[PDB]
Amino acid sequence: CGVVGIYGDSEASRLCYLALHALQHRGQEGAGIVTVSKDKVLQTITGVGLVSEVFSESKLDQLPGDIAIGHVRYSTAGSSMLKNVQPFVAGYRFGSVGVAHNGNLVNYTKLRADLEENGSIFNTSSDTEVVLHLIAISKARPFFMRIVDACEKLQGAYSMVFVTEDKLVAVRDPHGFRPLVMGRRSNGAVVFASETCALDLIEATYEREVYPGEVLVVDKDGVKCQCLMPHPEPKQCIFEHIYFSLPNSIVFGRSVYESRHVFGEILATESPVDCDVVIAVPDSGVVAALGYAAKAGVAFQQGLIRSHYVGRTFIEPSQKIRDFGVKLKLSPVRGVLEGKRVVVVDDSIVRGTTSSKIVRLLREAGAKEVHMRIASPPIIASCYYGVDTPSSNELISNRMSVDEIRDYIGCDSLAFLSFETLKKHLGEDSRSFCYACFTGDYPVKPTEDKVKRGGDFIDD
Amino acid sequence: CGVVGIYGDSEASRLCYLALHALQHRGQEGAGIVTVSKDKVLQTITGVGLVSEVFSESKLDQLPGDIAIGHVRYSTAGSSMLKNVQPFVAGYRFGSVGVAHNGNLVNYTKLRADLEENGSIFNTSSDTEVVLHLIAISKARPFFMRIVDACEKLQGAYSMVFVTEDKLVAVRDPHGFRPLVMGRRSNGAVVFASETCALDLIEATYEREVYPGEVLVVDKDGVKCQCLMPHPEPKQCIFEHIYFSLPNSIVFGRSVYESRHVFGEILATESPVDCDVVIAVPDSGVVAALGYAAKAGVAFQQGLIRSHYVGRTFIEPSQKIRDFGVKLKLSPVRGVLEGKRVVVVDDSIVRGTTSSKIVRLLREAGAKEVHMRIASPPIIASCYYGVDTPSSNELISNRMSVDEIRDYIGCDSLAFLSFETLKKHLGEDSRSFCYACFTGDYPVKPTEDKVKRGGDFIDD
Amino acid sequence: CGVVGIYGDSEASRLCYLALHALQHRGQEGAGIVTVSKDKVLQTITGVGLVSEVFSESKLDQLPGDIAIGHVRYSTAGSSMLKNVQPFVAGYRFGSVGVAHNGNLVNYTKLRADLEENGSIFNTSSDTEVVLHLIAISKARPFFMRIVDACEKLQGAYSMVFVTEDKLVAVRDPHGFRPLVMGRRSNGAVVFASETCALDLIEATYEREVYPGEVLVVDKDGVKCQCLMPHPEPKQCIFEHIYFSLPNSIVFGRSVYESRHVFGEILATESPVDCDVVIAVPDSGVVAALGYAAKAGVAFQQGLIRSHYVGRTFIEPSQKIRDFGVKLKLSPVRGVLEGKRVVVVDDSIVRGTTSSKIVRLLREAGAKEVHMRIASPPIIASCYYGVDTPSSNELISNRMSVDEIRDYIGCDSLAFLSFETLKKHLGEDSRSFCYACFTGDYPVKPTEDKVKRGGDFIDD
Amino acid sequence: CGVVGIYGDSEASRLCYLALHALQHRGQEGAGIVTVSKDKVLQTITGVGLVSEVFSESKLDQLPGDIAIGHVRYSTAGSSMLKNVQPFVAGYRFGSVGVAHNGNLVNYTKLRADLEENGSIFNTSSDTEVVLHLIAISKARPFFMRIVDACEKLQGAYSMVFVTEDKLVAVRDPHGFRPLVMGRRSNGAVVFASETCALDLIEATYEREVYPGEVLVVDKDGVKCQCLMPHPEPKQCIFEHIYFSLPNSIVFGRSVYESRHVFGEILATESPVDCDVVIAVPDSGVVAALGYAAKAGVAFQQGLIRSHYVGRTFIEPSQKIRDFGVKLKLSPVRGVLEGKRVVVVDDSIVRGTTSSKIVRLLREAGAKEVHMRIASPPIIASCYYGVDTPSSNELISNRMSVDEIRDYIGCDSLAFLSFETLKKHLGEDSRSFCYACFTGDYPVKPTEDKVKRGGDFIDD
Ligand code: SF4
Ligand code: SF4
Ligand code: SF4
Ligand code: SF4
């Protein structure tokens, strides 16, 4: 998912909408904005669909004010989602507060059961309602002290933005699992975003990361760090660099473009093969493939073309056209592929069902050989920190060998990025990253049965 | 507002939709349904607008199950409503529960402040969330005992339907302020509705009123009254008969058609005037006007015609046409009015602004005289029991005399229904009705500053 | 169908929209407007659905100008209509012209075949495209002379409004089959409409009928009758008074309210029966029923209530609820009907399927007897003049006797309005009306196989 | 624009929808389909917007049949388009016919004036209605002979597909200005499309080009060439290869991918400059830039990223952010640009306004130098053959020098593709291509004042 906050700008809702648009890749199932009116009321509008499908200019017009947070939401309920109320808003003894969260509370069920034992009710099963509940039972003042009280009980990943009647506060969990960054507009306006690309769009100059364990709060006085909670060696999600963030972004202080380009280079040195063309699975693996092509010394060619007009809800012929889902967004250039030995670069392999479709598509297009190259180590464990992966037995690198996956998807060779060379490339910062999906060893371990943060607002 | 519940029918969502349609007059600002899937999960879909604007056949298809409750909501936020989340659903230690409510908790702010003092948060400012909170902090079992526990702390009006993973329960407050009735379908299906007309549509035979102070619960065993909470002398809302319900309805055991027809008769005996025509303000006052015409001995004529295609949002010429809102739904028949002395019957006068528009419309249409007759006593005090009236100083009968209102709206005579003759017509049951809007004396008095239940899910 | 035209008003599109709304009863399948920009271009927007479903304030904004015509369209394709392009616009040697038509060209197929023989193509099968074709092959000048040339070849009914780059012209066929009336606004604005009620809404004072055979043209000079084409004794459609127009209207110089009230009176004198209540089928037959109740000396009671929220596309339970279409818009008042002998008044009986449903509905509501009274003579022949009736063998008065229809619909008695007493009530003007649907004798007879003017813009 | 036809498939409308989707780049302003029902009626549904915005599964369901043509339209009226009625359908003496056209009739106004002189009317100002008119006045039989008769009067570009009650015919004008290609499905189904990519999607194997001057007709007998009209030396649009078609396409027998890659190579040999990075303006110039990077020997990097979620209607901050239109779809990777000398490749320059925006965007992103390279010769003359270019004085290469454009857009160097080296690369086929937009010399010259085919169905 993705979060956004703006303090001190008369177009807070519009700028929040734009930054949510710039982060749309982080979550397509839902969107929402919460803005503080000049009379200090939290107006919220929230729906299922894309940021543009949820917000019209008519609706942005119903959100006047100087402060706003915004959330963009991923969900395996896909388009069959019934309700979405994130950013979550509530009222309690100290006023009104809304929160937008990106992450996953590992100890959600224990926290919820303990709160339920004293009569708490839950409108949604989302972590952010547990965060608000914890803040509410806190007896400390001011608001940031209650945020501190609440966060000390949370295990897991969280990057959050809170909005109140006159404050905007950003929180990054002590491990720093999830990206959060701060920028400033030409006027005093302060913005937080999940990635720097959202800052770039609305011309908020990137200033710094929000630090792991930090509680930044901006009000009339300005931006002030009012807590650097105790935090160990970091564990920032490596999958942000592998897959989840955009190449223009600078997440965790690194250029995502350079990460993926170097991954491609590593694949080419460490698992070369005679080939005539290097191509990508677009648009993800283009950058990595460029790097592979650079080291391998054979030219990159745009052998597959992503369609501009993909919809994700599309008609299919009655007489079966097999693999229509992919053929509706990937078109092969027969001129580039016919009779050639093709190295096709891609960013990962989880289920393995779509890689098979892509290999078949390339072969039907005239490819003589298809050598697959994955710009990531094999994914063996589930993510417990806020991005949905299937269960551990559904991960094809848990069931099958590398040679077995090679046979299953039907390609001549198959090579993953070596985990050890990844750590070598990171070098000094190799200790600053979570790799649980490649190793199986989690920095924060689940205390009982655990969940993916976003399902649906449908109640058991 | 209006509520509906169905237990024991494989088409629960569809039948709930139809009954909400049959109650659409009770509330046009929002609608919603909650249905229990075969796997015992509470699926809910809820939106702003009419029942047909909120529910498509596609969406009814996402609500399979045997149990469902439904709510249809009134709100002075009109079409500018941002969020509507009623019927309200939540999860707590004993499972999942949804509730639909019609009424008003007089002591909401005290109940909410006391709950806030122990760390409760509130997603909405609606009474029904307070009811769920109270149920949740109850330590009793079973569910109906917690309903009893919660209701003993509520002052005010409430007719509610609760749904859980396998039960449907109906609750009527001890004064019986608000209608609630029960009926049975051909199969075992049990339905509760705010008015009998919803029962009539979906062919659930009317069985009985839910009694004041009753907690009916239907499950696999059947319908069982499991509490008849202590209850004073009833105070059923007389405005259900004056204005709020449909003539086909039998609310509080009486035919609403007969109530309004007799009111018209009373107006004609007790305040006659020489006239040539008796007409109504449609479609509300047609029935009363018929009765007036009968007693007065001059013929009823349909002198105004309501338009079938009223939209409630509508374009207006830029060169202002005066009173375009009424002219867009009421068309006079000049043949019936030209040169005649007209007695025009209507159900009430609150603000008094539209009565003036209607008199002007009749005069422009050729009426020689316009004698206004209101099929209700003068409305002087605000309703504290779940249907929105303006504040007491905004009620024209608080500021002005009967003769003063006559002058302000511009008619030759003006007469209200005598309160004493209303009580005489009720006779034996004259003690069973709330009249606070005609007297000023409330059966349940507000403990502090008090609210109207509808609001908007926009947070202070 | 219904037509509208406005000349000389800067809000021509908005006023056209409003008048089309005021005529919405004439046709619900389509709508459209054509307005002349200040640069003398004919901007047109046209769609399937109601006037409000077709035109948004955003779309009215794309139609600036001083002149506009508008059409509202009936079609047996119902909501399954694929295209609608009426008002029809075209360009030809003398500029650009749009036309909106209400009526039916009896000799359409002959006219179209003769035009096809010289290479004409037809985008639609509508009469109005034939009218434009005929105007175009005319070699006369000015424009009204070409209209005259074209109309002399048309047999049948037509009330039309033409718009050009700077003129608005109204045409009524020599028999005057179809209503057309003219009014003036406060500024110079001149409007034509199918019924006076559309004039009344937008405050254009009714001036006069457009006369049978008249070609009125309004331009910068003003309104001028430039042709009173030869026309015989008129044959104005009696069904406008029986069914098609609104009671507020004055069609053909008569009050439709008085027509229907007198019809009710006639039914009561000429076919009385012992009864306890007189009721109507709402909203059509209320006026007639009032008159019946007046003569019969038993009180009218609103025994059925039309629903305000009828949709015409509505969900129905899977387990069969019989006659759900009617039960979804007509609700009986059991108090008015239980155990009583009911006379129910209605405006016609064509198919006879719905009268049976209504009788059954009344009986289920407790009626002891159901005496049906039809405020119209029996309909035996099809209309050849622009309002769709089923074929002659589908008309129940063609198959069955009066006593046979009585048995088929299941009522105790059944009585139609006597044709001879209808002619007596008309008196002097009894010669001025078409009665072909009651007699079978047509004033203008079809020259070959003939059509209903509106089908679909779907091509054979 | 783009055209599609399918004969002999029970899913003709669905397959037409998919092929129109695969051609969506050819025109975004409108879409439409015409399908022949089993009863031999031409059902058509047609609207403004994208293919997915125009067609729902509900609407495809209303188009059953075995034959269908489809059109996708470009229009400078953009989203402000009022009506789109293409594919055009009509009825005439020999039955019913629909046509979809891509091209431009140079002699439209003369053809239309001559047809107007004999009484023709025109619903639209589109060329395709003139084609239908000409077919209709033909006295020859069969249908293809009338097509031949009509085409002999047309000067200009046209690739058309006609549908009748039982035939599908394809027509390519004698110069072959516009692409049209034929393919076959697994069952007998025959499809025509503007580009091979539409064939590829729905698995119709590419068979051959439709030849310049050809009239192919497919019916029950099969595909038969029934006219190879006299045709000069071809003049196929070079802009199909420069800009208009997709790289997966094989238009005019050549791989568009190879054309653009070679153009990039030519730019690098003939106008080199010291640089550190080669980047493209996505996604258009990626292929050419790849070729440039190959010849120049400096690596390609994806220095700009096109946004996936471009909307073409989009909100903008009220405190103006400059160049928001481009910043909303192109994001620079600062890591790739900061301090580097950038060669940025793009496919053309017409107005020159957006190139300036892009250079500014690159400079703000840290580029030390910006060398622009255009993979096309300078565009000096307007296209008279069916794709909209501004007038000749609006083309920046008409006003300014190459060095002058370099200064105006603000880059260090600027180089266009040499026209002579383009002709050299074409070699044998250099005579088979229209270059009027680079030379000024037209193969077919306008006989009088001339138009762009798209317009809007708004009438003068
Ligand atoms: S388990 Fe994988 S996806 Fe989850 S935080 Fe760790 S590295 Fe990222
Ligand atoms: S105050 Fe009036 S409206 Fe309110 S419950 Fe009492 S009688 Fe009804
Ligand atoms: S046939 Fe009947 S409906 Fe038709 S014009 Fe004559 S009276 Fe009217
Ligand atoms: S003028 Fe240019 S764009 Fe037009 S057809 Fe010729 S080459 Fe193509």
Residue numbers in the entry:
A (entry chain B), B (entry chain A), C (entry chain B), D (entry chain A): 87 to 546
Quote the authors verbatim.
GPRATase catalyzes the first committed step of purine biosynthesis, transforming phosphoribosylpyrophosphate (PRPP) to phosphoribosylamine (PRA) with amide group of glutamine as nitrogen source. The reaction catalyzed by GPRATases is carried out as two half-reactions by two separate domains, in tight allosteric communication between each other. One is the Glnase domain where Gln is hydrolyzed to yield ammonia. And then, the ammonia is transferred through a ~20-Å hydrophobic channel to a distal PRTase domain, in which PRA is synthesized from PRPP and ammonia.
We solved the crystal structure of a recombinant AtGPRAT275-561 without the predicted chloroplast transit peptide at 3.07 Å resolution. However, the PISA (Proteins, Interfaces, Structures and Assemblies) server indicated that AtGPRAT2 exists as a homo-tetramer in crystal as other members of this family. Similar to members of this family, the overall structure of AtGPRAT2 folds into an N-terminal glutaminase (Glnase) domain (residues 87-320) and a C-terminal phosphoribosyltransferase (PRTase) domain (residues 321-546). Structural comparison indicated that AtGPRAT2 adopts an inactive, open conformation as compared to the structures of the EcGPRAT in the presence or absence of the PRPP analog carboxylic PRPP (cPRPP), which represent the active and inactive state, respectively. In contrary to the glutamine loop of EcGPRAT, which is in a closed conformation no matter glutamine binds or not, the glutamine loop of AtGPRAT2 exhibits an open conformation more similar to that of BsGPRAT. Nevertheless, the glutamine loop of AtGPRAT2 opens to an extent larger than that of BsGPRAT, and forms a 310 helix. The PRTase flexible loops of AtGPRAT and bacterial enzymes display different open conformations, consistent with the disordered feature of this loop. However, similar as BsGPRAT, AtGPRAT2 does not contain the helix and the corresponding region folds as a flexible loop.
